[PDB]
Design a protein around this nucleic acid. Sequence first.
RNA 1: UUUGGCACCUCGAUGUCGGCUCAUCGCAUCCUGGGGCUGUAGUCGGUCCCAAGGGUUGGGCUGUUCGCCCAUUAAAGCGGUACGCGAGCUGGGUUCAGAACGUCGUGAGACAGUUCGGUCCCUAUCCGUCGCGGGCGCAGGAAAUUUGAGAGGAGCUGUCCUUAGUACGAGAGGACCGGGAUGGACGCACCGCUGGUGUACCAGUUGUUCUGCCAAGGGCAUCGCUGGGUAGCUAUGUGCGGACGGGAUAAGUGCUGAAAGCAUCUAAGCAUGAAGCCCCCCUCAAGAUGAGAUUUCCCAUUCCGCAAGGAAGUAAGAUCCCUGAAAGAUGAUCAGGUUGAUAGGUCUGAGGUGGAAGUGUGGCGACACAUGGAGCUGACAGAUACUAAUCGAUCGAGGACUUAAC
Lengths: 55, 9, 119, 115, 207, 122
Amino acid sequence: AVPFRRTSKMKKRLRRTHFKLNVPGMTECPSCGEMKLSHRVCKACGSYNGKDINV
Amino acid sequence: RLALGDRAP
Amino acid sequence: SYRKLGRTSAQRKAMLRDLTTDLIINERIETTETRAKELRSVVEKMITLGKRGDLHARRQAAAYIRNEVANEENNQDALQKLFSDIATRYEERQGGYTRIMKLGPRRGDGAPMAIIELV
Amino acid sequence: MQKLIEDITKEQLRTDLPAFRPGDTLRVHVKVVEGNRERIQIFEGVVIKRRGGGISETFTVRKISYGVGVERTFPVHTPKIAKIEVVRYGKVRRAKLYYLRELRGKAARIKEIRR
Amino acid sequence: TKGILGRKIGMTQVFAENGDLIPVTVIEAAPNVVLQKKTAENDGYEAIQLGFDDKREKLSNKPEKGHVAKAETAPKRFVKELRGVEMDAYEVGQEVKVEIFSAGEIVDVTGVSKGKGFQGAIKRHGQSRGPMSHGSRYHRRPGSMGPVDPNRVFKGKLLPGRMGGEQITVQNLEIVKVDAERNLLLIKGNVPGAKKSLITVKSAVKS
Amino acid sequence: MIQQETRLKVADNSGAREVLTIKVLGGSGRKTANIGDVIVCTVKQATPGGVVKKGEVVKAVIVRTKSGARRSDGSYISFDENACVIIRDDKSPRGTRIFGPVARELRENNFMKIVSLAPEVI
RNA sequence: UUUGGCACCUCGAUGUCGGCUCAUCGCAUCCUGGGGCUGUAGUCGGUCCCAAGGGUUGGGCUGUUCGCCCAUUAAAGCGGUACGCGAGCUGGGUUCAGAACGUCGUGAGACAGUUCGGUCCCUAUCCGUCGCGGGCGCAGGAAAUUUGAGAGGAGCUGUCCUUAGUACGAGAGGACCGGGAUGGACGCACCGCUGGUGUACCAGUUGUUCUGCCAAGGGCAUCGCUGGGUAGCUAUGUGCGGACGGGAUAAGUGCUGAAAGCAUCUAAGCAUGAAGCCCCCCUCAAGAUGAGAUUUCCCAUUCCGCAAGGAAGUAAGAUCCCUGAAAGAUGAUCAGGUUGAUAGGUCUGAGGUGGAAGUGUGGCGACACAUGGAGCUGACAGAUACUAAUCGAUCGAGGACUUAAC
Ligand SMILES: [K+]
Ligand SMILES: [K+]
Ligand SMILES: [K+]
Ligand SMILES: [K+]
Ligand SMILES: [K+]
Ligand SMILES: [K+]
Ligand SMILES: [K+]
Ligand SMILES: [Mg+2]
Ligand SMILES: [Mg+2]
Ligand SMILES: [Mg+2]
Ligand SMILES: [Mg+2]
Ligand SMILES: [Mg+2]
Ligand SMILES: [Mg+2]
Ligand SMILES: [Mg+2]
Ligand SMILES: [Mg+2]
Ligand SMILES: [Mg+2]
Ligand SMILES: [Mg+2]
Ligand SMILES: [Mg+2]
Ligand SMILES: [Mg+2]
Ligand SMILES: [Mg+2]
Ligand SMILES: [Mg+2]
Ligand SMILES: [Mg+2]
Ligand SMILES: [Mg+2]
Ligand SMILES: [Mg+2]
Ligand SMILES: [Mg+2]
Ligand SMILES: [Mg+2]
Ligand SMILES: [Mg+2]
Ligand SMILES: [Mg+2]
Ligand SMILES: [Mg+2]
Ligand SMILES: [Mg+2]
Ligand SMILES: [Zn+2]
């Protein structure tokens, strides 16, 4: 099966309506103030839940 | 891939 | 249920045994998160044997733990460490000998990584 | 299993049954109702399995009758059994004796225990 | 009409007096509460709204709390209406209990069928496989989509898709036992849904 | 669970030793017959000199099966073999003796002569 | 629906028989429902009328369609849909190249004559079909519960007993109508039962290799093989369904009744009467833009603006993120997120396996017995904050105008 007609620019753009990234689930790190992914160790300073991990 | 083809003899 | 981790039964057993011994020796490893989550139960059940301490328990553990050096100074095996150091540490604690902390995706394949460590 | 299912069904568990396990030979006294009359037919045979829990537990007994194997599976706690009596305790090495289905005669013999 | 809401606990079996072994479903229905009476004047039809299963306060919201104030009860997890009931027989706040039913009573039971996820035409619609050998490359496929002439597939050509998770009524089940202390109905046979799922038990419509 | 092509031992002295099931009787698309059901069948093996001969089409009632049968009390009966008894249209056996145990289910279906002739009814 | 006639579309290809899979439509009805006539006593039938709701078998032979046959069945309908359906399958036949027979031909070769053999490609763009989300709408923002326009589903039928050996009949035989019981096929649900599976459950066992050795174990050999098996998923297993009725009708039967002093079911008028029609039963359903209803919650903030509008922070509430499963392709759904049992672990069970290791005793030994229904045990139950569901952040009203009744 092959396309019977080429897809117009418009139909290509309508299809790509939902082809997007979302903003990360990010929050300010209470330790160092850099943004971190919620529920992950903060990469910048290595803190999680008010404790240093990378000790 | 047919032996003869469409609307064969 | 339980996870398959993209591996055949035998491969998956081999890998869980490897990771289990790695975490006994090192006390903290980094791995994919889904591996960490599978490893918790398997490791905590080895610590339960260690805490039992009897010969039957030790041989059950010997069927799982790998034959690796946990301490070059003392010539201590992973099994010997499990049954001495780890078991003693967790005498009073009732389960939950490990914790998983999530790190975020690794470059290379976006795999969500995690630290699993003994508590 | 839920304590709740256990509790609803406890009253219907029979207490009067002897302990038996697969390989034991029972006489199972079965209430039978041919016509309006009631009578006891005895089924004597080897216990070949015992599966399930609580009120749902069943057991299966096997006998050769007139050169034909016959199995009867009963609910352990059926009231249709007047009584079970253990004739002899067998020595077997497993829970399910399905290998007996293919054996007849001397090959199908089970050694007795001094129990 | 009468009815109650419970959870499906599971199945077991019960010996009858004649010695028959009856498979049963255990429904645990702690006393339901009448939360609202819909009337022909106000609502355009007569029904009662039964609440079932107390929910923790954290899990409630202010709109829920307010709705159950008149019935003077904790917020309820499951709320369903019963039509066809005797309106005068019920009051807001009234407890509806398993002992509305009695052993031998014929009921209809309604619940959501267990979910099966995306299923093919063999499992979902009970279609035949094509041959497994003799050169077949037609095993678990759904069959011709239809004739040429319409230049289209008619509605109701059955195909793969999500199976289960549907409301299902089983009619004319018999109450085997009512246990008022434990808030249990024991119903002969099997009923829709997973364990812990909400079951509605109603007096049978064809009685 | 007896269907077209199932072969059965014959549990009687009618002359037939083995029959092949031609048809489960009692409804249009009926796949399977069980204890107490009647089947049409052809005689595949016969005892020399018997009444029933090889190749005869005959009716038979199933009296034992491996699948067996469930009873209302929640008990089951199974046998090591599938067997039937050649009958006339009135349910009387064409032979004079029945071999091996038959199931109680034959009483329910009013095969009384068979039940009486059988060495055991379980 | 046939064989054809014609040669109008298609030869820069409209794959061509049969079967399989999936149907759907017509009615000229095969069965079941209702009837009229009968050379209809009864039981059976014949013939015509209404009726398309549902149903309408498995085999032997043949590529076969068809047909004949076996055995059933209430019945084994006839046709249409590109001789329905090959970007769904098959490829026996037909329809290439090889070879052969009969036959024809001097020959090369030829034959809707036969014979043995002979490559079936395609990642779905659009509409369409089946599922599942996101968006906005529905004159405030929310949380639930709903009405049902409308749509889909279901719709089959046997046998026995009884009425009754009654009616009918010389007998042979043998009913209607009406009760009751129990099936077949089909469908829905579900795993307590019977079984199936069950690759992180238990056990036995071969070879070799490793843990130094013994003992005890690990690895590989299809999960090495073999015997069992929990949860889950399941059918062949269990439960349940098509009940009981309304309304209006078809053919048919009429009642009263004139036109037409009679007669006449019809013209006025009034009935009756089908498995069919509309309901009743089951499911979806307000994007039903005609956007419905009920209950409950929030509450009228601040700043820009001449207002009209606009912006911001919020309420009720929801979400991100996280623990997950009863849910699941992914989204979604549902249970939870620390005054929390959501998951793991832990402890206690259930079920499964079937008697651990160690030690002892007996035996020359293989092994047996004891300690001890032991040991081990994924998914199942209960309990328990030990571990992880941290800390956060984001979104989300202030309600237009007119008229009428207050
Ligand atoms: K052409
Ligand atoms: K093809
Ligand atoms: K095509
Ligand atoms: K198109
Ligand atoms: K099951
Ligand atoms: K709406
Ligand atoms: K031992
Ligand atoms: Mg392997
Ligand atoms: Mg057991
Ligand atoms: Mg098939
Ligand atoms: Mg294949
Ligand atoms: Mg069109
Ligand atoms: Mg011309
Ligand atoms: Mg072209
Ligand atoms: Mg007609
Ligand atoms: Mg044609
Ligand atoms: Mg065609
Ligand atoms: Mg096509
Ligand atoms: Mg061919
Ligand atoms: Mg010549
Ligand atoms: Mg030719
Ligand atoms: Mg010729
Ligand atoms: Mg409607
Ligand atoms: Mg179970
Ligand atoms: Mg099972
Ligand atoms: Mg050794
Ligand atoms: Mg090796
Ligand atoms: Mg190798
Ligand atoms: Mg609305
Ligand atoms: Mg827990
Ligand atoms: Zn930081």
